[PDB]
Amino acid sequence: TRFHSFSFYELKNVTNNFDERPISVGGNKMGEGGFGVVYKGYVNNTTVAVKKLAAMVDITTEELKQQFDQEIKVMAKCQHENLVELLGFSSDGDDLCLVYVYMPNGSLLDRLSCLDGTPPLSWHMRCKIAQGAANGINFLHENHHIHRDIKSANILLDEAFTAKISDFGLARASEKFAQTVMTSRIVGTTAYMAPEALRGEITPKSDIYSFGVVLLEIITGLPAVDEHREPQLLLDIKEEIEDEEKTIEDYIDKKMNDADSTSVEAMYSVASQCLHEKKNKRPDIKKVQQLLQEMT
Amino acid sequence: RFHSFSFYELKNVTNNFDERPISVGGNKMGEGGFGVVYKGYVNNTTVAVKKLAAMVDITTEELKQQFDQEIKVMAKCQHENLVELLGFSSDGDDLCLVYVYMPNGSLLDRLSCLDGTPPLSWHMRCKIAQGAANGINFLHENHHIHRDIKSANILLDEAFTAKISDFGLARASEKFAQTVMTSRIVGTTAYMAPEALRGEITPKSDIYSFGVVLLEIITGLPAVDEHREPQLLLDIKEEIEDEEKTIEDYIDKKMNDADSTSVEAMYSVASQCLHEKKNKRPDIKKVQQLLQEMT
Amino acid sequence: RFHSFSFYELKNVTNNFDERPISVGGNKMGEGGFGVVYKGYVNNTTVAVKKLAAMVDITTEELKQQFDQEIKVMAKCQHENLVELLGFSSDGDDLCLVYVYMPNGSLLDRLSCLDGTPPLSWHMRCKIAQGAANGINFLHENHHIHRDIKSANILLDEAFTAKISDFGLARASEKFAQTVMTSRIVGTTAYMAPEALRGEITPKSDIYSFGVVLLEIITGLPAVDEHREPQLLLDIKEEIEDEEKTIEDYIDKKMNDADSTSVEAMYSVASQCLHEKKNKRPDIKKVQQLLQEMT
Amino acid sequence: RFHSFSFYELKNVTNNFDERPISVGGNKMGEGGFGVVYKGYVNNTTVAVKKLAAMVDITTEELKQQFDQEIKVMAKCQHENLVELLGFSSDGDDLCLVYVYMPNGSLLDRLSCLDGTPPLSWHMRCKIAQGAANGINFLHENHHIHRDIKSANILLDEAFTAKISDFGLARASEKFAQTVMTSRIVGTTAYMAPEALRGEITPKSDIYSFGVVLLEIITGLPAVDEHREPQLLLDIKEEIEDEEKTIEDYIDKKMNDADSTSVEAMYSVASQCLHEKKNKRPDIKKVQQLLQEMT
Ligand SMILES: O=C(Nc1ccc2nc(N3CCOCC3)oc2c1)c1cccc(-c2ccncc2)n1
Numbered sequence A: 001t002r003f004h005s006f007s008f009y010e011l012k013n014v015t016n017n018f019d020e021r022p023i024s025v026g027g028n029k030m031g032e033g034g035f036g037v038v039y040k041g042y043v044n045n046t047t048v049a050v051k052k053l054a055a056m057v058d059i060t061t062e063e064l065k066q067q068f069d070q071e072i073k074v075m076a077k078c079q080h081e082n083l084v085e086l087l088g089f090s091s092d093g094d095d096l097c098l099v100y101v102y103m104p105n106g107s108l109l110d111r112l113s114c115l116d117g118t119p120p121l122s123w124h125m126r127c128k129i130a131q132g133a134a135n136g137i138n139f140l141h142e143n144h145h146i147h148r149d150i151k152s153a154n155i156l157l158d159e160a161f162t163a164k165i166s167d168f169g170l171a172r173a174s175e176k177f178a179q180t181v182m183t184s185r186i187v188g189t190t191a192y193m194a195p196e197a198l199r200g201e202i203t204p205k206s207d208i209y210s211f212g213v214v215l216l217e218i219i220t221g222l223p224a225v226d227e228h229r230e231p232q233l234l235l236d237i238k239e240e241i242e243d244e245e246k247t248i249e250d251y252i253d254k255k256m257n258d259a260d261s262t263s264v265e266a267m268y269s270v271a272s273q274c275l276h277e278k279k280n281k282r283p284d285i286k287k288v289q290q291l292l293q294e295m296t
Numbered sequence B, C, D: 001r002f003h004s005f006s007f008y009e010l011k012n013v014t015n016n017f018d019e020r021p022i023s024v025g026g027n028k029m030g031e032g033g034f035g036v037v038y039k040g041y042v043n044n045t046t047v048a049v050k051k052l053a054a055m056v057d058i059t060t061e062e063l064k065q066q067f068d069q070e071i072k073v074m075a076k077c078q079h080e081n082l083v084e085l086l087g088f089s090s091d092g093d094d095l096c097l098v099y100v101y102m103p104n105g106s107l108l109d110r111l112s113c114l115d116g117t118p119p120l121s122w123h124m125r126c127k128i129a130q131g132a133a134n135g136i137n138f139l140h141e142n143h144h145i146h147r148d149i150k151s152a153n154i155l156l157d158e159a160f161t162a163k164i165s166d167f168g169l170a171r172a173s174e175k176f177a178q179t180v181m182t183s184r185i186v187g188t189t190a191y192m193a194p195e196a197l198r199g200e201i202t203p204k205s206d207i208y209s210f211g212v213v214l215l216e217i218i219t220g221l222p223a224v225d226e227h228r229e230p231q232l233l234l235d236i237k238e239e240i241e242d243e244e245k246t247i248e249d250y251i252d253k254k255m256n257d258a259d260s261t262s263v264e265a266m267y268s269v270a271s272q273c274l275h276e277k278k279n280k281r282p283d284i285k286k287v288q289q290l291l292q293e294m295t
């Protein structure tokens, strides 16, 4: 309600009739994936990140409307240094759009991969980013919220490479741990998800796991999944290291000249604790926060 | 023309061959190959110092042949796109070679962004392709085969001028002989040409292998990766030639100035180099001409 | 917030603050009246540590005041285009500030091609310019004045991302109250606007100085040169405006890719920065918009 | 036996002598007075066609005499540090000279990094100095004076081999019976020795002007700059000789690999060259020997 209500044809323009070409070459479309497509725009002189929702999977009306509702609803209460900022939205012209503040460095995912040829993130920059992400999450768990879709792709970077969590559409209003809560409709990103999450069980323990996957993604500079790589899953490296088959040293990203063993292995151990298969044998976000704060 | 070096000079200038990486204040630049190179300083000039090491695979006298050959070829061949040899060390029998240091290391490394270097642009990638393609021309013109064209050997100076290093396996060719063989295989397999693996030495082998480097330039992927499907880069060429994937699927996303035409032009050249039939391949002069015609 | 260091730590990481030049296996990177700087490795991360050498110029208190003003602004401000302070070492005397190292040094030196570096070409010279303008904007958003904009204080990282450095002389402005004064004038005279030299303080003094920098980019000439006519770069603008000379003449010849429209565009910016009435200048927001509107 | 070309044959390869720079698809590589240099292609061979041009100063016969002289020398003199002629065109009333193309232009240009070429290191320069010196020694071994030795006329090949050029003003000499005189007077002021400027002729003069080229190499500064203090280069010898400045003040900073023991050696020779009293200067063979002993 405090968020500004745009009209659809107020922001179809700024997005350049939603120009499907990238910034690289003329057009607007910055990022795809999820349940829409994120374009750039220009309002109040400034740049912004617009997201036109669209039905790729889950082809049903109110579903995407409720995730839209959820996105907004969450963003109302939740505000933090390590969370994105919604400026407004657009429901009229029934194509659900969302206007945010522009993050000039986009996803952690992309900046690890160096998509469009960006410089490789130094160890030191990542350390901060890992701490930042963990902090933003802690706020959600404090404000009793589960994200249900934590991944590099949903962790974005401002003008100073500040980790800010994004996409609270699948986020769930939670309790302490009432008792074990469930869904029939299971949703999330497979390579990142916790086992119980993959069994439809909902819990703030499940977002800890997936952050483990990010902390690895960071250390290795390898995504959680790749259909042309053995092992296809990053996750599987844990057991490789856990069976002394290789060390973490072997997997440390080589696109860095500022990495050291102590910090790396500290960030490994933390990441492994998150990825402990017993949901309840894992540490809580705050314990993680601490561990990362201690690392430096 | 060159310069002799008491071993200690070379030891000292490299902090007694500081095995620590140069990326963290050490002196070691790279290993493997044949020996191990260190970033040194000789009379204020920064140099490279390939200190050879004895591997149970090559003889202690077979390693002289290579040490000799490296020198033999240099003496004749000086070129803007070929690394320079200042001197050497036969004394301290461990055998170090002293070259002019190359501030941007290997193409391979910079294709990987090793130690956190920025990803090379397409435009810059073209200059490098053109660089080595001239550098090879000078070898064929001077009746020489390299026998190990790899991005590991295509080094870069402070302006990214490509210069071919490591003439340990180089030989001498003469005219339309062909079928010329050996009883000992040597080279880096992910780049080597089919016949070359058989021993069959010929300048046309170098073309094929340059063909492989052009892929590495376009894809940003090494010729071999053990943790990848398919582990050898050539397989891709067939996926593209049979249309399962396209050239576009394997463009390096770690650049953003790479237009579709010149990239599909550079691929054509690599395809033509990587002809299964050796004699349908273009000799370096055509490659070089197309690489001109590209930009 | 920042890791306050102790004592020796920074000495031992800097080879006892070894004074030798980096380009010949030394430890000293740069110098100035403010103090001296060295390259150091702190836990594998390379850093720039500035050990503060006092002169006849300023006293303990003044020197400390500047040592603090860095931290106060750095506490508030971190940015892509603003260098990154990691810590400090106030214990004892001499004083140290720690930053993240910047592998391509200052804009002034890569314009001068100091230590055999290649000459930055026009496209890089815009990126850098466009970068520097962003850093200035963020300070002017945080209501801060730099009071010493120059190419020496615009450093270049691995990827030549331009970052604004050094905030000893930095000051916090107002929204729009009134022009401010001081009894001790400060900075590098070659860049400093007339008012700034009169002890005046205003956001638009940084603009003017940034205007000078842009000439240093376009021409490749420093802001001043003892052995050159005219010794001050600022003079050549009037020689262009009163058209005894063309900006065309003064363009840097250590590059090939410059084109007239974009170069005259950057001088069209540099001109408006260098207006004599401080108010007739456009604010950095405009400048930034122009440098963007260029490419 | 040089090939005799048709003026049309040479107009073809140059595209009617296309006046643009090659940057924008032209053929003009440079000029000066004497004539103009165009880029060309015959039998693949990149070539440097030199279309002689009349500049209010020379009669069509005074220019022809230099045309005849250029060839007269080339015919007799062949050295790996002297540029190579291939032919000419007398018919078509323009007069032309076809030399093998030099892919790294002049010494002058590269010192200046013209068109953004990377700065030449100390090492390269030393090599170059030697190369240039040896060619002169060949000229004087076949009793000849160049009479216009400058950076410009020293050109650089694909391995940066120093080769001297333009012998239109080269004169035939003997075993120094007496000194020769003229009533011309030819040459380029900033490089010319006093007696040369007085209209004397001798091989002593080339030696002096080589000194000027050596400084240029140490300094990376041209023999003259009308916007510089001192405008001449050879005055620096005085400032050095009167210890007002040091040679170490003037070393070109666009290297990273200079050293005192070798640079101060080069200066010592360079000074001997510039000895006001001509006869006190050492014969080129010495210069050569000295330069040889410097490495
Ligand atoms: O800024 C955003 N996103 C982005 C993505 C991608 C981006 N790529 C860049 N670049 C510049 C720097 O150069 C590389 C390209 O900036 C990029 C920015 C943003 C900001 C706020 C919310 C949301 C979002 C919410 C819900 N669902 C999806 C997204 N997104």
Ligand SMILES: O=C(Nc1ccc2nc(N3CCOCC3)oc2c1)c1cccc(-c2ccncc2)n1
Residues within 6 Å of the ligand: B022, B023, B029, B030, B037, B047, B048, B050, B083, B099, B100, B101, B102, B103, B104, B105, B106, B114, B115, B117, B155, B165, B166, B167
């Ligand atoms: O400079 C060389 N090599 C190198 C390797 C690795 C290097 N890594 C860096 N850097 C870290 C990354 O940042 C840039 C500096 O510089 C690097 C430089 C060099 C130079 C001359 C000959 C030869 C050579 C010859 C025969 N056989 C093998 C090699 N090599």
Ligand SMILES: O=C(Nc1ccc2nc(N3CCOCC3)oc2c1)c1cccc(-c2ccncc2)n1
Residues within 6 Å of the ligand: C022, C023, C029, C030, C037, C048, C050, C083, C084, C099, C100, C101, C102, C103, C104, C105, C106, C114, C115, C117, C155, C165, C166, C167
């Ligand atoms: O990297 C820095 N500085 C530098 C200087 C000189 C340098 N020369 C080189 N190189 C040799 C030549 O080759 C390229 C690298 O890298 C050089 C780097 C740096 C980094 C961060 C802050 C500050 C600084 C702050 C406040 N006041 C002054 C400085 N400085």
Ligand SMILES: O=C(Nc1ccc2nc(N3CCOCC3)oc2c1)c1cccc(-c2ccncc2)n1
Residues within 6 Å of the ligand: D029, D030, D037, D048, D050, D083, D084, D099, D100, D101, D102, D103, D104, D105, D106, D115, D155, D165, D166, D167
């Ligand atoms: O190659 C020559 N000359 C040249 C000039 C200028 C050149 N500029 C380039 N390049 C653009 C810049 O990049 C490098 C290549 O190559 C350049 C080459 C040459 C060769 C032989 C004789 C003579 C000559 C003789 C009598 N009078 C005048 C000249 N000249």
